[PDB]
Amino acid sequence: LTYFSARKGKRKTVKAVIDRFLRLHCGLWVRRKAGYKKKLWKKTPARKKRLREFVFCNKTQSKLLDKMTTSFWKRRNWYVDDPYQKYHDRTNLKV
Amino acid sequence: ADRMSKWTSKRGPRSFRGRKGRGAKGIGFLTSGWRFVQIKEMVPEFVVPDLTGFKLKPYVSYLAPESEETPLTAAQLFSEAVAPAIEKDGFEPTQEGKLFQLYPRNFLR
């Protein structure tokens, strides 16, 4: 976790989370269901279809992932052409 | 077993007791059969002159005057001993084979 570094004296982000998750400005964490590339011959088509779809994270898991990251990862992402451009902002919500 | 105790001749064994000793200043040497040789040349000779008809005394009188202190320097001695320098209008540069050499302290006091 490293709350304070040894060279600059700041926080540090676990690259494992950055590589296994995806940050969004809306406040949700996207992931991928495990087992989507191992033992696919014994899985029924419905199971394979459900495993090849993205999934969100819970409140506690999202907070843990945020704690494991810094404010740099919370920046926007105005990519020239990204499939997740229409998901950074969440609209139509009432508590 | 004492560090503050200054080592001297009244501590060690017979060997070191007889070897070190106080400021003896070796005057001779030994000749095998424990027969010390007293070199007459190394024995000092106190050159004491005769104190007959001495004027001064070991104590001065307060009635005498007072003079300023002026440590004698080489320049003053040279200016004083300036007879041949003025007559130009004798010196001992090398004194290696001299009786009492100056630079190498060979004369006692």
Binding site: - | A1, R3, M4, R11, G12, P13, S15, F16
Partner: protein, 46 residues
């Protein structure tokens, strides 16, 4: 037997095991004397 008496004083052995000559022969004693002088002790070695 009595184990409270192990010391057999002897100036010869003392000065031979902890002497200026022995402390300056090897660099170990040199460093020892240097550290002692740095500490500020009165006696440096027997």
């Amino acid at each position: 037997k009595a184990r409270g008496n192990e010391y057999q004083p002897s100036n010869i052995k003392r000065k031979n095991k902890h002497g200026w000559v022995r402390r300056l022969s090897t660099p170990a004693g040199v460093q020892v004397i240097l550290r002692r002088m740095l500490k500020g002790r009165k006696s440096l070695s027997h």
